Structures are given as C-alpha cells and as structure tokens.
Amino acid sequence: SSLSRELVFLILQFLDEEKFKETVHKLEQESGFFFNMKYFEEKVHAGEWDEVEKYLSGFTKVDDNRYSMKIFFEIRKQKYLEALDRHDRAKAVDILVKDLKVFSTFNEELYKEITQLLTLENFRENEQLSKYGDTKSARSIMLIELKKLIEANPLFREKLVFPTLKASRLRTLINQSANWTD
C-alpha cells in the first residue's frame, strides 16, 4: 500500500534519531524505498564492495537496464584493479571469473583485454589506465561517475530524495494515539 510505504519513512526518521545506524540502512535496502546517497558514497570510499553490491541489490539487479549494468561493471572493475595493485593476482583471477565474466557476452573483446591486465607488471602499462592514480583517487573519481549513473537510472530517479518532514513525526503521532501499548 501507499500507506505502508510512507510509514517506512517515518520509522526511518526515528531510527536515525535513535542513532541506530545499521538498522536504518538495512531498512532502506530491504524496503527499496530510499537510496541513501551519502551512505553509498561513504561505503564506496571505504572499499566495502560486498556491502556495496548488497545495498544496491535492494534497488536493482545487474541486468535490469543499461544504467545499472554499467554501475555494476564499474564497481567490479575497480575491485579487480585494486586486487591487481596489491599484487594479489589470486583474488584478481577469482574476481575476473566470478564477477566480471557475466559482462563478456555483451563485450567479448573488452573481457579479453581485462583478462590480459593480469600479465602486465603494472596495469598502467595499458594506456587507457595509465592515469589511475591510487586507491583513494580512483574510488572517488569512480564515485563521481556512479552518482551520475544512479541519478539517471529510472529505477532510482524517484527514490533519491528523502521527503522532508517535522522532527520526530513518529513520536508525535504515537503521542496523538496516546492522547486519543494499550
């Protein structure tokens, strides 16, 4: 219902005021009603890729449309690059097969080119990546793209803005029920 939906938001407001950080974002994710930009942003910077994909998965799947396909590919690209940078070529190959391979069907050559970064001494030998700066510069610069990709995604375009309402509305409405457990 539309009733149920707007109750979610009230509850959300409450949790945030009770400093229940985790519970807030599990709700956002499971309800799919509000995508917390500033939360997403923070998680990207931290390199929490398992959580990042998990939170996204509450709002869209990898193959839903063209926007979210690139959003995912982009994350699983950076994940693979950092793996490469810390020279953990084991985790890279794992990433390559489990995470990046689903995008090969669409782009067979691109996948081969991503696979060949494994043999380079430093993947910045590849000219298209010679500008990749470090972990921190690269995540933020990727984050910028992601904000755009999300805000242009139709599945998100109605969910990014938290409807503004009075401080502690849920406590006040509960108070109206007490004026009117049990």
């Binding site: 063209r66 690139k70 995008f103 691109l110 590849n126 298209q128 990546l129 500008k131 990709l149």
Partner: peptide, 9 residues
C-alpha cells in the same frame, strides 16, 4: 554529457 558503454576509461 553522459555515455554508458563499457570500457576501461
């Protein structure tokens, strides 16, 4: 001003 094909850069 946006461009959503898949590549390295």
């Amino acid at each position: 001003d946006n461009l959503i094909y898949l590549d390295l850069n």
